[PDB]
Write a protein that binds this ligand. Structure first.
Ligand code: CA
Ligand code: CA
Ligand code: CA
Ligand code: CA
Ligand code: CA
Ligand code: CA
Ligand code: CA
Ligand code: CA
Ligand code: CA
Ligand code: CA
Ligand code: CA
Ligand code: CA
Ligand code: CA
Ligand code: CA
Length: 352
């Protein structure tokens, strides 16, 4: 009569210090460090911190046999170590895997953190061989993808590709093929790399092949914001930050619902009608992925998340505006979405 993991009370979160830290690092394949400021002296702050500790404790327990360690770094009592390690942002989590350091910018909960760490544990490059797997690859599009064709894993150009892959791990999946048939189908010349924007079927080729790590890294950085991007728990705050002006276009759509899916197809049509519009950026949030936030969103934005929604959220002014859609009617077309967004973003309203 199976159950489901619950914290067993055993503390597995290391108290880090100048004496132990080097050994802490040598012990684990992946090490997650909580860099936090001590809680306020009041019992409400003490409480709050202890209940928050349950998250990483559960994660540490679950991942114990997978070579993952968790450690705590006090911003004051461990300031020396924090400096040496490069821990600069108070109250956050840094993840170390070999030579890579990753600032966690995801949802702070046990399941999402464990999912993130399992992703960090995976290898940075996935190999595609054969037409069946190629066809599957072509069906995955809710994420940026890079795919390159190289001679073999010993190729210097493959190694540069893998270096760049580690740099963006595990946020941006990298794929390689050593299979000339797959390459032919993808139209990849040897050492050529194709970049697929999220929700786009046609790739862009990284110019000036063969590509150095520098060329790949610069290209990915310049192209990191897809016109349409899915908000994901594991990286939600990184997605939300990484906006120049504090103004966001947000679309709510439940992929598992016909209306939601219909809206999603419309958002994709908008994106594909704006392939030369480097300013347009829409964040798609599927409410099914964030059930604990749904009532908060509904209350804050005054919308019903049983239905698709699109709006403009201005963080600076702490306000927003949402497109009115009548339930008795079909959803707006891509053109009508485009028109409404333009009207809002150029500036409007005034009533009586
Ligand atoms: Ca300490
Ligand atoms: Ca990094
Ligand atoms: Ca969760
Ligand atoms: Ca594979
Ligand atoms: Ca090509
Ligand atoms: Ca080059
Ligand atoms: Ca913006
Ligand atoms: Ca519906
Ligand atoms: Ca685009
Ligand atoms: Ca409702
Ligand atoms: Ca409909
Ligand atoms: Ca138009
Ligand atoms: Ca129009
Ligand atoms: Ca207009």
């Amino acid at each position: 009569g199976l159950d489901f993991p619950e914290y067993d009370g055993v503390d597995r979160v290391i108290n880090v210090n100048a004496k132990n830290y080097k050994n802490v690092f040598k012990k684990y394949e992946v090490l997650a460090l909580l860099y936090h400021e001590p809680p306020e002296d009041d019992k409400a702050s003490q409480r709050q911190f202890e209940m928050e500790e349950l998250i990483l404790e559960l994660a540490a327990q679950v991942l114990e046999d997978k070579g993952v360690g968790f450690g705590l770094v006090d911003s004051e009592k461990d300031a020396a170590v924090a400096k040496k390690l490069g821990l600069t942002e108070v109250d956050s989590m840094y993840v170390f895997k070999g030579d890579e350091v990753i600032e966690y910018d995801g949802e702070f909960s046990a399941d999402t953190i464990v999912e993130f760490l399992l992703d960090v544990l995976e290898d940075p490059v996935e190999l595609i061989e054969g037409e069946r797997e190629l066809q599957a690859f072509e069906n995955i599009e809710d994420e940026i993808k890079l795919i390159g064709y190289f001679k073999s894993k010993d190729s210097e150009h493959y190694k540069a590709f893998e270096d760049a892959a580690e740099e963006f791990h595990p946020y941006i999946p990298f794929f390689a093929t050593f299979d000339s048939k797959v390459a032919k189908k993808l139209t990849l010349k040897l050492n050529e790399i194709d970049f697929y924007e999220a929700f786009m079927e046609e790739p862009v080729t990284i110019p000036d092949k063969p590509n150095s790590e520098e060329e790949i890294v610069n290209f990915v950085e310049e192209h990191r914001r897809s016109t349409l991007r899915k908000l994901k728990p594991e990286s939600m705050y990184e997605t939300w930050e990484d906006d120049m002006d504090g103004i966001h276009i947000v679309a709510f759509a439940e992929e598992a619902d016909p209306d939601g899916f219909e809206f999603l197809e419309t958002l994709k049509a908008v994106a594909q009608d704006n392939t030369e519009n480097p300013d347009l950026s829409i964040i798609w949030i599927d409410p099914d992925d964030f059930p604990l936030l749904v009532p908060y969103w509904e209350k804050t934005f005054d919308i019903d998340l049983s239905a698709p929604q699109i709006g403009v959220v201005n963080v600076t002014d702490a306000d927003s505006v949402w497109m009115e859609m009548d339930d008795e009617e079909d959803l707006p077309s891509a053109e009508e979405l485009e028109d409404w967004l333009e009207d809002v973003l150029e500036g409007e309203i005034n009533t009586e």
